Design a protein that fits this description.
binds a molecule of 2 linked components (NAG-NAG), six-stranded antiparallel sheet, EGF-like domain, binds calcium ion, five-stranded antiparallel sheet, hydrolase, 3 domains, membrane, binds a molecule of 4 linked components (NAG-NAG-BMA-FUC), transmembrane, alpha+beta
């Protein structure tokens, strides 16, 4: 089924019958002291609470903005489920209300409302607007012309990619003719995006609040500089990892994939010579975690022996102040797929540490290759519960007919529920878009688990593949499993699901979004880097927010 098709704030508030300033602004110093105190109100639905907390994580992962639960502070933000989506711009000193209505529970919409509370206003309302966009007054609904009036000093250009900008179809009298068009033609496909903060959105936010760091980013490494991101090579090992440069025919670095000469560097450990169980260590610089859980993401390839082994280790403080204690975290091993692969590893370091990669030779004679590393990042966040790579996605998008589908591997959540994803690359329901939809899977735990599965938030994300989290605009969508999903869709998959021979399992009816992303949006940015599509999934209980 379709859950709910995505809608912009202008259409939501128009359907709710509001007449707010610039659509979502209530008018009745202006800069906040971090952390901003918040109250999640009783009337605010369970999905909305979880989505607001997920939006606060995005702020702590891209900015120095921070939020705390209320304790009797003077100024605060109270989040409620009144009519429409709206916010009061800037600190009001006595507290302010942010409204997240029905159909308003989306990362990009909540980020937009929080940016109003931080004191930002829409981009088409800047005095310089007329130089960058056309406003088609003859296409606006009568009485709504004031929503296009012009109304600071952060010294930045006009941002067509801004999370604050209105869509081409804002307040239209006709559904086919836009009220806004860009004076640079390419941007008619871009204006009014609902993915993430733009780069300029973050630069303005940083200039406004004196930010130069991020609460939940520890490290990243593309290996493009000569000092290799402060990583070092030990001597309690047999050999060394080489810093190769994409020059050799048929070898290309993940960061650039051969788009530039001389640039594009990866770490390599060769396995085609010497003796078995020879190894090499690559070790990070010392890191000081602020939270008790971290996620290490990286890209790798293994063209060598099936007996070769990439292993991730941590070295941590021995409790005297010396980072010398080892823990083995994770092991990776090869198969017939010689393309680049993505890996995620959970770390739980409460004290200072260094993350380590060990490459190991297996049978050197049955090896004609090596272990390859690029594009690391380390964030003070959970890892994605499931990850699905779809290969040759451009070829899939040309070959699949409307209503054909792909299905993921079966994943498992921390509670033990099985889940997966259904992808229709060519939608029948929205022509020119993907449909991504969630399904629950039968698994070995089904007998002890509660049914139907309810109060469990699903987050689906299409990864932007850019190595620095600040620069990423990953498309994201959220729902909470509910009793109201009937055709309850979330009952035990043996009773309400269809058996499939690929997973050897039952899979539920799919629920999610037609029009998750357009084909045009996937063909830009870094969503289809290497012609690989990467989808992330979480399936997490939010009943503790009740
Ligand atoms: C020698 O190594 C090959 C493959 O390893 C190769 O090493 C270098 C030459 C590389 O450049 C690559 O070409 C390659 O990594 C071994 O062949 C492999 O055997 C395994 C185990 O039988 C196969 O895995 C299985 O394959 C079957 C289907 O055939 C599946 O049903 C199983 O689920 C499982 O995946 C693997 O596919 C196969 N690979 C190839 C390319 O043939 C070979 O066994 C090994 N020989 C010795 C003496 O160790
Ligand atoms: C947040 O919104 C609520 C609801 O609109 C405001 O409470 C109202 O306050 C006015 C003025 O005191 C009263 O006339 C209404 O009867 C109140 N309504 C309700 C349901 O309480 C509240 O003042 C707003 N401000 C904040 C930040 O709490
Ligand atoms: C919205 O605009 C579209 C595009 O101009 C309108 O479609 C045209 O309508 C006129 C009058 O019926 C026809 O002569 C054209 O042949 C239509 N062109 C296309 C491309 O369909 C549409 O009717 C408009 N809708 C409203 C309510 O005004
Ligand atoms: C994606 O498409 C490419 C191109 O067809 C595939 O690469 C070919 O793989 C076959 C079988 O191994 C080789 O004989 C060709 O020489 C390869 N061509 C090129 C240009 O590399 C690739 O395997 C496909 N990937 C997947 C997994 O779908
Ligand atoms: Ca060494
Ligand atoms: Ca690189």
């Amino acid at each position: 089924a379709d859950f709910g098709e995505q809608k912009d704030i202008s259409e939501i508030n128009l359907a709710a019958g509001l007449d707010l300033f610039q659509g979502d602004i209530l008018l009745q110093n202006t800069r906040w002291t971090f952390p901003i105190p918040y109250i999640l109100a009783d009337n605010l639905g369970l999905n909305a609470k979880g989505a607001i907390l997920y939006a606060f994580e995005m702020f702590r992962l891209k900015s120095c903005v921070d939020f705390k639960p209320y304790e009797g502070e003077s100024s605060y933000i109270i989040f409620q489920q009144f009519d429409g989506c709206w916010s009061e711009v800037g600190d009001q000193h006595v507290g302010q209300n942010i409204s997240i209505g029905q159909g308003c529970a989306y990362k990009a919409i909540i980020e937009h409302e929080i940016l109003h509370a931080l004191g930002f206003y829409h981009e088409q309302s800047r005095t310089d607007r007329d130089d960058y966009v056309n406003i088609w007054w003859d296409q606006i609904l009568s009485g709504y012309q004031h929503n296009f009036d012009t109304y600071t000093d952060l010294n930045t250009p006009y941002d067509y990619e801004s999370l604050m900008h209105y869509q081409p179809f804002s307040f239209n009298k006709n559904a086919s003719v836009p009220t806004i068009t860009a004076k640079i033609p390419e941007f008619n496909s871009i204006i009014g995006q609902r993915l993430d903060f733009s780069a300029i959105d973050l630069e303005r936010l940083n200039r406004m609040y004196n930010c130069t760091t991020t609460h939940t980013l520890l490290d990243h490494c593309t290996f493009e500089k000569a000092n290799i991101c402060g990583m070092i090579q030990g001597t309690r090992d047999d050999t060394d990892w080489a810093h190769q440069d994409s020059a050799q025919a048929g070898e290309v670095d993940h960061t650039l994939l051969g788009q530039c000469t001389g640039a594009g560097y990866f770490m390599q450990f060769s396995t085609s010579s010497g003796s078995a169980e020879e190894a090499a260590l690559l070790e990070s610089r010392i890191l000081y975690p602020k939270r008790k859980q971290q996620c290490l993401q990286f890209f790798y390839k293994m063209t060598g022996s099936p007996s070769d082994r990439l292993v991730v280790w941590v070295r941590r403080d021995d409790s005297t102040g010396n980072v010398r204690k080892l823990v083995k975290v994770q092991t990776f091993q090869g198969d017939d797929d010689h393309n680049w692969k993505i890996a995620h590893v959970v770390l739980k370091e409460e004290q200072k540490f260094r993350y380590l990669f060990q490459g190991t030779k297996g049978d050197p004679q049955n090896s004609t290759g090596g272990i390859y590393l690029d594009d690391i990042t380390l964030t003070e966040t959970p890892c994605p519960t499931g990850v699905w790579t779809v290969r040759n996605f451009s070829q899939v998008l040309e070959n699949t007919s409307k209503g054909d589908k792909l299905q993921s591997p079966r994943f498992y959540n921390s509670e033990g529920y099985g889940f997966g994803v259904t992808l229709y690359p060519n939608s029948r329901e929205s022509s020119g878009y993907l449909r991504l939809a969630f399904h629950v899977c039968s698994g070995e735990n089904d007998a002890i688990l509660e049914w139907p599965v309810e109060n469990r938030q699903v987050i689906i994300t299409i990864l932007d593949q850019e190595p620095d989290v600040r620069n990423r605009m990953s498309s994201s969508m959220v729902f909470t499993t509910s009793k109201s999903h009937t055709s309850v869709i979330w009952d035990r998959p043996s009773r309400v699901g269809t058996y499939h021979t690929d997973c050897n399992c039952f899979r539920s009816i799919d629920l999610g979004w037609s029009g998750f992303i357009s084909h045009q949006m996937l063909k830009r940015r870094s969503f289809l880097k290497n012609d690989d599509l990467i989808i992330f999934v979480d399936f997490e209980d939010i009943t503790h927010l009740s």
